[PDB]
Design a protein around this ligand. Structure first.
Ligand code: 2BA
Lengths: 349, 349
């Protein structure tokens, strides 16, 4: 959905005065047909009759005028009302898929002029926005909130299972018994969780001001999942992987490819041909996830720790003195790394 | 009913574009509140909000605008629409006996400004016009046609009875056997008939263009009745009476006085006070009616004929040469007088 169209959709999103007027208009079962132009006298050929108003916009003015027959003409920034009660006469030969004079008009005029045209039929409660060759249906808030509330509830469940996989993996990681299946299983759930966020995003945008709470909820639920999945990819890919590449992996399984077990492992660099093989492939975390997340070591410095000790298992055996020999590890980072690991080994294993 | 107000009623009479709009508005159960001014600027303190239109009037435009809440402001000549959807704010302390905000505003505003205000409420089908301290309710054509059609039917019955009275009177006149009762009975019926005409006149006016057939019917039924009654009065009053005098006696009995038998015969100059006396009072026509109406002798000249012969009976005895002595009677008018009376005597008596 092009950014160009999204800007226009904002014009009629909950919170704006225009949308507040359309809401009333929908509720009164008036229809509406609204033409958005900045230079009215250039569109003189497609606007016939009606009254020339040239007055400052308000929701209540628009509502009142919509009681009259025909169409309304506003400025593109919704600051002026230019015409009311007009007859819009776009070229009849422009192809249209719409039904009814109102919507067929809106589409043809939108195509003819490159401007926004808004149509509301008298008995339906949707707002149809036409821009160029685009058509976007904007839904009522109760409909959007229902989908979003379900989507969030769905996310809670994915997120709970992600947490349970993660904490199981944590244990395996600290005991160096991780198989590729555990890794892939965790990544896949994380991927799916983030896909859901991607799918619900348009509804949330569409909700405008009424989606503030929903955004906070998605934020709380997913706030560090992406960074976590990036560090998992860096800890378990077959060949060393820069952060940027790991993020591109994440981005791939969120959008382009489908997060299937075999596919994820293949992208991680493992020549596998069947899911049952994943349980036999032993792997060891390099230690980035633990070093960044728990020891608060910046990734830049993380690499230096890994280049030296290669795996988390070795890092967990290093003395403070050993760890200080790494570039970037003073006495505090050294004890942060060593105590955070021994603390986790004690508590979790 | 002041002529000032009658000019305003014309504005909304059948046939005008304004009335046409108002009929549509009544038909659609929209309401209306309309304010007629010549300089909107002068009245900007009683006009709040709404839309400045400043566009040419049409019925369709007024109809469309009336779909909106509030009031409409037109020029007094009903050639411009100035405002729509406005809030009218006349002085709340001005007395009014109207009901509901719409009609209380209308009457206060008209009183305050000296202008016309029109109110139509949504559920009734009347147009209320307010001018200064005047209120005039204008009716639908179908209500008016009903009363007028009845009035006409009533006039037909009065006119037939009048013709019967007259034809009997004629016979009596020609045989010189008329009594006061016969005259008074005929005048009374004539007076009552023209009263009915006077009373239905306001209905006729309210009908405007739709009153055209009604006016034609009145004209045909009453064509010569006034002249006829004037001539009767000149012929039968106690002492001789000038035409314009008799015209006033007609005016009196049509408008201000009741055409009771004693009242009529008293003002004709007879000293009776009991209705039964009229049968015993013998009268003889001067001859004006027969002279003007049948012999086609102009009143100015008939005076001289009555001057000389005094009564119809004596005129009917005069020979052509006898008549020719009168100032104005040549052989043409002399044979006209002579032959038309004798012709009448032959056929009627
Ligand atoms: N060229 C045509 N061809 C075939 N049928 C025609 C027609 N024009 C009108 N009709 C019929 O007349 C109905 C009444 O239109 P109305 O002007 O009162 O009310 C219109 C009008 O206010 C608005 N509308 C539709 N097209 C418009 C346009 N090009 N410009 C301004 N307003 C339009 O939508 C309202 C509902 O129109 P709706 O189609 O449901 O209903 C239309 C349609 O059924």
């Amino acid at each position: 959905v092009p950014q160009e169209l999204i800007e226009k959709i904002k014009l009629i999103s909950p919170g704006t005065e225009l949308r507040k007027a359309l809401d009333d208009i929908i509720n009164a079962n008036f229809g509406a047909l609204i033409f958005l132009v900045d230079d009215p006298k250039k569109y003189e050929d497609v606007i016939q009759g009606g009254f020339w108003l040239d007055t400052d916009f308000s929701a209540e003015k628009l509502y009142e005028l919509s009681k009259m027959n025909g169409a309304i003409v506003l400025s593109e920034d919704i600051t002026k009302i230019y015409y009311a009660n007009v007859h819009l006469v776009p070229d009849p030969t422009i192809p249209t898929g719409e039904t009814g004079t109102r919507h067929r008009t809106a589409e043809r005029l939108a195509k003819q002029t490159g401007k926004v045209v808004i149509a509301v039929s008298r008995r339906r409660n949707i707002i149809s926005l036409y821009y160029k060759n685009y058509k976007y249906v904007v839904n009522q808030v109760d409909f959007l909130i229902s989908k979003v509330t379900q989507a969030i509830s769905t996310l809670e469940k994915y997120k709970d299972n992600f947490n349970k996989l993660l904490s199981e993996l944590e244990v395996l990681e600290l005991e160096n018994r991780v198989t590729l299946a555990d890794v892939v299983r965790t990544l896949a759930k994380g991927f799916e969780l983030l896909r859901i966020v991607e799918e619900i995003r348009p509804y949330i945008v569409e909700l405008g001001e009424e989606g503030r709470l929903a955004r906070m909820q998605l934020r709380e639920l997913t706030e560090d999942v992406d960074d976590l999945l990036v560090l998992l990819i860096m800890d378990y890919s077959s060949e060393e992987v820069e952060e940027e590449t790991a993020q591109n992996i994440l981005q791939d399984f969120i959008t382009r490819r489908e997060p299937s077990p075999i596919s994820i492992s293949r992208v991680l660099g493992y020549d596998v041909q069947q899911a049952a093989q994943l349980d036999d492939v032993l792997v060891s975390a390099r230690g980035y996830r633990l070093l960044k997340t728990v020891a608060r070591i910046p990734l830049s410095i993380g690499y230096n720790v890994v280049r030296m000790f290669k795996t988390l298992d070795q890092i967990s055996k290093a003395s403070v003195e050993d760890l200080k020999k790494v570039e970037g590890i003073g006495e505090k980072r050294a004890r942060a790394i060593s105590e955070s690991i021994s603390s986790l080994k004690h508590r979790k294993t």
